[PDB]
Design a protein around this ligand. Structure first.
Ligand code: ACA
Length: 79
C-alpha cells in the first residue's frame, strides 16, 4: 500500500503485494520493463522498489525478475 506516496513504507524493500521478490530494474532480456523516465510524479525506483511513478494509486506497483511473476503491488503496510 501507499503508507506515503513518497514518505513512509516498509514492504517497499522488494516484494510484491503479498511478498513476491520484486526485481532490480534490470530489463526485459532476462525480465523487467524499461522504467526510469523523470516525467513521472516521483522515482523511488531504487534498484528493486515499488512506488507509483507511473499510475497506480490503488497500490505501489512493482514488477519482478520474471514473467509468471512479473508484477503486482508491494506488501507495504496498509495505510
Ligand atoms: N500502470 C502500470 C504500468 C507501468 C508498470 C510497469 C509495467 O507495466 O511495466
Amino acid at each position: 500500500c501507499k503508507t506515503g506516496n513518497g514518505k513512509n513504507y516498509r514492504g517497499t524493500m522488494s516484494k510484491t503485494k503479498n511478498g513476491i521478490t520484486c526485481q532490480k530494474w534490470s530489463s526485459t532480456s532476462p525480465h523487467r520493463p524499461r522504467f526510469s523516465p523523470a516525467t513521472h510524479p516521483s522515482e523511488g525506483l531504487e534498484e528493486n522498489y515499488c512506488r507509483n511513478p507511473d499510475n497506480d494509486p490503488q497500490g505501489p506497483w512493482c514488477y519482478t525478475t520474471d514473467p509468471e511473476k512479473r508484477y503486482d503491488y508491494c506488501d507495504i503496510l496498509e495505510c
